[PDB]
Design a protein around this motif. Structure first.
Motif, short mmCIF file in Angstrom:
data_model
loop_
_atom_site.label_atom_id
_atom_site.label_comp_id
_atom_site.label_asym_id
_atom_site.label_seq_id
_atom_site.Cartn_x
_atom_site.Cartn_y
_atom_site.Cartn_z
N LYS A 1 41.39 30.89 42.09
CA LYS A 1 40.73 32.12 41.68
C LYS A 1 39.29 31.81 41.28
O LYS A 1 39.02 30.77 40.68
N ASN B 1 36.23 33.99 39.41
CA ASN B 1 35.92 35.24 38.72
C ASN B 1 34.71 35.04 37.80
O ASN B 1 34.87 34.72 36.62
N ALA C 1 36.43 39.52 41.79
CA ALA C 1 37.17 38.27 41.87
C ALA C 1 37.56 37.97 43.31
O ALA C 1 37.61 38.86 44.17
N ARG D 1 40.60 35.70 45.19
CA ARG D 1 41.84 34.97 44.98
C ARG D 1 42.49 34.67 46.33
O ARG D 1 42.76 35.59 47.11
N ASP E 1 42.64 38.88 46.66
CA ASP E 1 41.53 39.67 46.13
C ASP E 1 40.29 39.36 46.95
O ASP E 1 39.93 38.19 47.12
#
Lengths: 59, 59, 140, 64, 136, 138, 140, 136
Positions: free
Chosen positions: C90, C92, C99, C101, C138
């Motif tokens: 991830k 972020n 974000a 992912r 994401d």
């Protein structure tokens, strides 16, 4: 096939709890705390066995 | 696979029924044994459901 | 229009390995490489290509605080089984749009480091691998 | 005799996989049709699976 | 794609699909020479196709295997060796291609060369044609 | 250039032009010897030419394809295999060269070797010649 | 005559990829390579050449602010199609004589980067490719 | 140096001189074995020389060409192919060497392999000797 977070269900749960959804952004809606509840969605398509034959014969 | 046209080697013979009889029985949602292609097998793998709504499709 | 604040800083990355969070991660790489074949035609000067296949490569780097890799591998390699792993990374950055992912699946590690120390130097571990497929969770 | 007829009834119910079913259907049709002396060549070109229905296009070439 | 070898109702499906496959075909041409004109040639008939396969039988359930439930390596070895021993006429098919024909097994070699207990093999097949004897 | 194989009015054009092509030609030289002189040679007529072709049949429309509308790879394979099996006499031509003659097929091999479903092939062709038939004198 | 002001500065470059402006571009390269064959003649000391063909190569470097390359490629490589792209580069220095606009066509990328981060390091992406043809829109 | 192939007054000069050339010569030796002394040998006669040439016919006026005004690649191909077809006796000469003899063409192969439309070739030649029939 796909598996995802159910966005509409989370929005409805947050609205029911009374949180102000207008000020927060989409990422914050996705990652908001829900208190021991999870919402997901998925898409599949199920196969079937072959049981009929259609022949188109030319001359 | 599907259970349709599965043949039973144990069975020796069954009461005679005509083709229209078998078709009408299948349309009513019954699982029957038929004699076809030189053997004894089941006609089609369908269950009891007959009436279809928008929620429950033909599948 | 671009802003300088939108460039993602690597200090905000996170890694999960086989479902356990790894707090000592230093860097993470994962890349897919495509294989090409050159096409040459008599009477034409230009050269073209077609794709043949793809392969996955990557690596991990950790601070040395415990024997995580040895416990992860164990005797699976010695006993002759073929172990595979799943990794989730991830990224972020608060100043970015969102974000990112990714799930990296079917990982096979390349080696195992038992000891690598020197007087006056702090310890680190490096672990290259190869993989076969990935999923996006994401998208920024 | 042993030559006349077609074995297409052995495919009903997905006894084989889909690719093997396609191969077998093509071969069955070709071998069954080619016993007529007035038929010169048979080709089974298209083949599609949709729900429980298998569709195909057969082209028959005769002397006429 | 899938690969099958079948003897009547007894069927076997290969667990690991090979890296490549090739079909060889040839035709015979008869040549003669004429005084002062040179060489001439005529058609003489077609030969039988041949096909060779190289792969391994896995000793464990790998990620890249075609399916699950295949037998042990030496079970596959014993089955194919028996088929070659008795001279059975088999049917060989590769799905999604035009390869579907009756064959006979010419050679079978297998080996072990690492620490995994996998068995690598090479299989040689030849096209089979039955002869028609006319009657009256 | 273009590559064509034609049987009467049934014409086939190769979707992908090969990387190279070559013609092989020979002449027959008879060898003898004479005592105390050594080896001698004479002319024994010309031999038939031969050519070999290597390319692939695409499974999709490529930017380097010669034209659009070509058949599927195994349709091309089936056509050429039928021609080779029956021993037809064909005409082979490469445009913008001097290659235009009648041929007969000697060998055909095809294979698959990657994930693209393209079919790679090799085709061997041999030149064909006809002899005149004698006529009864008037 | 040459003035020091007339040298083109790379800050004044712009890039369009598949019709969309890339505001986070860092550098751009595109070059044609020619293949030669050596000619050697018995009895002559010198050596000469003849051209055989040509090929195109290049690369792009971006700041990592979004997942542009993954959306561009998507599943096209995985499913087995052959995606090709068009790029347009412009170099318009105010102090130079004029602008320079080139269209690079029929672009095939070499790999795809999924994750590449390290703590305390800003992110960047590098993407090599090959192409077959080009056009000049604005010349100088 | 220059390379020529000539049939009576009809002459052809190669436009691109090759990278190398070699002449092969052999002689025959007859061997016998005598009891308790071993092998012996005697002279048996000389064989015919052979020579092979590889180059290309250019499709444009290059800097390294021998001269200007040569025909098209396929014109050269057709001329040499006709000479080989009829079995003509030709004269082959390389200037500034000792190579000047009558030959016959054994083989001719040509190809195209790039984007320039040049034609590469290989030419095989064999020495020719006429037989003398005595009279009285």
């Amino acid at each position: 096939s796909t598996v995802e977070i159910d966005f509409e269900a989370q929005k409805s749960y947050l609205k029911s709890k009374g949180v102000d959804l207008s000020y927060m952004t989409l990422q914050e809606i996705k990652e908001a705390n829900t208190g021991s509840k999870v919402f997901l969605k998925a898409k599949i398509k199920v196969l079937d066995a072959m049981e009929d034959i259609d022949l188109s014969i030319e001359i | 696979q599907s259970v349709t046209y599965t043949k039973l080697s144990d069975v020796v013979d069954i009461p005679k029924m005509t083709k229209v009889d078998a078709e009408s029985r299948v349309n009513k949602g019954e699982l029957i044994l038929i004699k076809e292609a030189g053997a004894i097998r089941i006609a089609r793998g369908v269950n009891s459901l007959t009436e279809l709504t928008a929620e429950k499709g033909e599948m | 229009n671009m802003e300088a604040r939108n460039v993602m800083s690597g200090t905000w990355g996170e890694l999960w390995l086989d479902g356990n969070k790894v707090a000592e991660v230093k860097k993470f790489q994962a890349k897919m490489e495509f294989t090409k074949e050159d096409i040459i035609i008599a009477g034409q000067m230009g050269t073209d290509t077609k794709y043949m296949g793809y392969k996955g490569k990557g690596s991990i780097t950790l601070y040395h605080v415990s024997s995580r890799m040895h416990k992860l591998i164990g005797e699976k390699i010695k006993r002759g089984s073929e172990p595979r792993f799943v990794a989730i990374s991830k990224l972020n950055d608060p100043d970015s749009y969102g974000a990112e992912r990714i799930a990296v699946k079917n990982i096979a590690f390349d080696d195992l480091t038992l000891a690598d120390w020197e007087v006056g130097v702090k310890g680190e571990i490096e672990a290259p691998f190869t993989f076969t497929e990935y999923d996006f969770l994401d998208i920024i | 005799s042993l030559e006349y007829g077609t074995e297409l009834s052995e495919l009903i119910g997905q006894k084989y996989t889909k690719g093997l079913t396609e191969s077998e259907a093509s071969r069955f049709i070709k071998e069954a049709l080619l016993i007529n002396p007035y038929i010169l060549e048979v080709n089974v070109k298209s083949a599609n699976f949709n729900r429980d229905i298998l569709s195909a296009n057969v082209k028959v070439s005769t002397i006429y | 794609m899938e690969m099958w070898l079948r003897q009547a109702e007894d069927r076997f499906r290969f667990p690991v699909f090979p890296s490549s496959f090739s079909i060889n075909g040839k035709a015979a041409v008869n040549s003669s020479s004429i005084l002062k004109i040179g060489e001439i040639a005529t058609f003489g008939g077609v030969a039988l196709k041949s096909i060779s396969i190289s792969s391994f039988f896995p000793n464990k359930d790998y990620t890249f295997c075609d399916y699950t439930g295949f037998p042990s390596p030496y079970d596959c070895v014993n089955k194919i060796e028996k088929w070659m021993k008795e001279g059975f006429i088999l049917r060989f098919t590769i799905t999604e291609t035009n390869i579907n024909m009756e064959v006979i097994i010419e050679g079978f070699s297998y080996e072990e060369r690492d620490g995994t207990r996998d068995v690598y093999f090479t299989l040689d097949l030849k096209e089979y044609k039955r002869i028609k004897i006319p009657k009256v």
